[PDB]
Amino acid sequence: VDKDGCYQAALRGLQAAQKFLVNEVQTVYQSQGVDISDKHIEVIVRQMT
Secondary structure, three states: OOOOOHHHHHHHHHHHHHHHHHHHHHHHHHOOOOOOOHHHHHHHHHHHO
């Protein structure tokens, strides 16, 4: 937040949270043999973040 701008810091934090959430939802769905494309999950993760 202080080494860079507040906007860039918010962008990096939300990007890390988005990557974590997308990867975990995708690996739980892949644990059961269910194939869902990444765009379907990250539309909803975009609405969350």
